[PDB]
Amino acid sequence: DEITITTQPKSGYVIRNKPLRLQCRANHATKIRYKCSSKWIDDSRIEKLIGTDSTSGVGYIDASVDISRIDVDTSGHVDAFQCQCYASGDDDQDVVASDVATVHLAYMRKHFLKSPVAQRVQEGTTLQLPCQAPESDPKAELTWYKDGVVVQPDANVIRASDGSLIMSAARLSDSGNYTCEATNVANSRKTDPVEVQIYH
Amino acid sequence: DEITITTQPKSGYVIRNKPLRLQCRANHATKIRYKCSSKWIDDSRIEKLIGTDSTSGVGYIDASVDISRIDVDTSGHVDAFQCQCYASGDDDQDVVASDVATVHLAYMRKHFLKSPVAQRVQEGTTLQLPCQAPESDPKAELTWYKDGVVVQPDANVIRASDGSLIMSAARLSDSGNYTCEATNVANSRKTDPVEVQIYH
Ligand SMILES: O=C(O)C1=C[C@H](O)[C@@H](OS(=O)(=O)O)[C@H](O[C@H]2[C@H](O)[C@@H](NS(=O)(=O)O)[C@@H](O[C@H]3[C@H](O)[C@@H](OS(=O)(=O)O)[C@H](O[C@H]4[C@H](O)[C@@H](NS(=O)(=O)O)[C@@H](O)O[C@@H]4COS(=O)(=O)O)O[C@H]3C(=O)O)O[C@@H]2COS(=O)(=O)O)O1
Numbered sequence A, B: 001d002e003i004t005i006t007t008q009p010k011s012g013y014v015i016r017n018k019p020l021r022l023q024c025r026a027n028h029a030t031k032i033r034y035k036c037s038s039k040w041i042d043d044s045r046i047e048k049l050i051g052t053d054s055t056s057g058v059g060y061i062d063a064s065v066d067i068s069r070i071d072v073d074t075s076g077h078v079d080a081f082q083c084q085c086y087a088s089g090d091d092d093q094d095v096v097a098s099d100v101a102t103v104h105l106a107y108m109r110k111h112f113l114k115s116p117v118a119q120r121v122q123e124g125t126t127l128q129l130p131c132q133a134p135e136s137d138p139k140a141e142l143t144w145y146k147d148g149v150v151v152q153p154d155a156n157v158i159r160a161s162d163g164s165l166i167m168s169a170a171r172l173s174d175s176g177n178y179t180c181e182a183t184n185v186a187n188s189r190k191t192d193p194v195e196v197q198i199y200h
């Protein structure tokens, strides 16, 4: 009969030393191959699970491969590294190609594009503490910590869309050691603590 | 009132370069400290989240710490590393200690304690292919592959509890290149393919 793809391979990230696993499943197919950016993935790397659907009697083949950082780096198309699945069978059936799955190397650099700095400032002063994550993929999420406690926005302190922390009228209770943390699936990094003194 | 623990710190593994995060949550408490293998965790390392449930009006404190491979290795109790959290508060309230969480370093060695070997054997022979994972913590899980297809136990081939593959009466169709794969949270390893020839 006709070959169609049941599970489509999904884009995703290679994180640290953990390959990205693509899974691809096709009904009425006998062979699945993976081609990634003009190169063919060596068929010995493909882990196949073959059977017949008990309910409908329709055969299937479920193939998965681990795409590694070695693969992406040796491709020649690192910034457009993308993979596809090919379901063939009898001499009479048409090869059916899958969706394109893109594989990216997830990372987070070491240097914060914006980081706070120590301040000694008088009570009532509006103080703004900047923070912007290091260049990262996927995008990072910021959390702010005051002496180890996650800062909770209220009436005087607010988290601004640019990632900074704003205290409208600095209370004495706002003094402390502040740190910004950036997090994504690849790493989690904190600025060195800066000190904030509020006096009168 | 009364201090009680909502989230108990849970045992677990340090995997690769990923610390284990112990989390500990207490009602009506104001401070949580962590002690690990008799040593006290420096309170600047504790990520604390403080608030009031509002639904129940009952205050809480949710504290977390990342236990690293460096922590376990410099402890002096590498094979018995265990941690606890202590939720204090007012000078009037009793310190409440939590469950003991043990931290282990997850690993899996390089060579299999048992691996198959090539066989050329006559049809009808009972054939047994051994496999035992490399020494690993936590315990590893075995998968068998025939030329890349996951072996499905049936009537002639059966997965035995000792990890081996047993073919009661070797059929011609049982010839192929066989591989044993071991998996645990720390790594995944495959024996080199061996060939099994079944003749007449
Ligand atoms: O040029 C480089 O420096 C570099 C190049 C690589 O591109 C890079 O990959 S990336 O994915 O990170 O972008 C690579 O990072 C390595 C790093 O070099 C390793 N160092 S090593 O162990 O000496 O070899 C390593 O270390 C990190 C671990 O996540 C972790 O170690 S442990 O828990 O396994 O013992 C440790 O974690 C810190 C954590 O980062 C802290 N976060 S904070 O925001 O900074 O506060 C905090 O939670 O404490 C823990 C524990 O601290 S302790 O160890 O002092 O107790 O340290 C990390 C580190 O290196 O600083 O792994 C990364 C990732 O490698 S991977 O191959 O991609 O997996 O560096």
Ligand SMILES: *[C@@H]1O[C@H](CO[C@@H]2O[C@@H](C)[C@@H](O)[C@@H](O)[C@@H]2O)[C@@H](O[C@@H]2O[C@H](CO)[C@@H](O)[C@H](O)[C@H]2NC(C)=O)[C@H](O)[C@H]1NC(C)=O
Binding pocket: A147, A175, A176, A177, A195, B044
């Ligand atoms: C905020 O931080 C200051 C100083 O931080 C210290 O130095 C850093 C490099 C880091 O190693 C931190 O963990 C240190 O705490 C704190 O002032 C220190 O307080 C301790 C005891 O309270 C004292 O022994 C040190 O000498 C002090 N250091 C200095 C430079 O004065 C301060 O207590 C922290 N908390 C608040 C709310 O400001």
Ligand SMILES: *[C@@H]1O[C@H](CO[C@@H]2O[C@@H](C)[C@@H](O)[C@@H](O)[C@@H]2O)[C@@H](O[C@@H]2O[C@H](CO)[C@@H](O)[C@H](O)[C@H]2NC(C)=O)[C@H](O)[C@H]1NC(C)=O
Binding pocket: A044, B147, B175, B176, B177, B195
């Ligand atoms: C079992 O394997 C042999 C050899 O496996 C080859 O070497 C491995 C290291 C790995 O890279 C495999 O992918 C290789 O196939 C097979 O013998 C080969 O058969 C093909 C038939 O298409 C032939 O083109 C090769 O030249 C042969 N190579 C050698 C060294 O003999 C054998 O066919 C496999 N048996 C089964 C049932 O799959």
